[model samples]
Target: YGDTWAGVEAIIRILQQLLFIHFRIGCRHSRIG
Candidate 1:
């Protein structure tokens, strides 16, 4: 893979994990109610 594409792929993976965590926290808050 080219250098630029490789960097973008890593960023996408990190962002995906961040989004998952954000939703998980929101779910926890609703469950507590």
Candidate 2:
């Protein structure tokens, strides 16, 4: 259970990072246009 929860937490972290970078790029592109 401990290892399983750790894996889930890692996945969530990746998702958060992906989302943050994704939106950051979108906003930057919009400003450039």
Candidate 3:
């Protein structure tokens, strides 16, 4: 594990994807009209 920057970026990418999926799920429940 010599590449600390690479590791940090990979973790951020995974968390970003999770956040995006959570946002999509939230949007699904917003159409309650």
Candidate 4:
């Protein structure tokens, strides 16, 4: 159970990073597109 929880946390962290990157790109595109 602990390992599973750790895995989930890692996935969440990765997703958050992806979302942050996409958000930055989205902002840049909105300004330049």
* Best prediction by TM-score: 3
Least accurate stretch of 10 residues (summed lDDT) in model 4?
A: 24-33
| Model 1 agreement with the true structure over 1-33: per-residue lDDT tens digits | 677898889888989999898788898877776
TM-scores of the models, in the order given: 0.66, 0.64, 0.67, 0.64
lDDT of candidate 3 vs native? 0.83
TM-score of 4: 0.64
TM-score of 2: 0.64
Best by lDDT: 4
| Model 4 deviation from native, Cα RMSD in Å | 2.4
Clashes of each: 0, 0, 0, 0
Give the clashing pairs for model 1: none
Quick one: RMSD of model 2? 2.3
For model 3, name the residue pairs that clash.
none
lDDT of each: 0.86, 0.86, 0.83, 0.87
Regions of candidate 2 where Cα sits further than 4 Å from its true position:
none
Off-target runs (Cα >4 Å) in candidate 3 are none
Candidate 4 residue 23 C-alpha distance from true site, Å: 0.8
Compared with the true structure, the alpha-carbon lDDT of candidate 1 equals: 0.86
What's the C-alpha lDDT at position 10 in model 3? Answer: 88
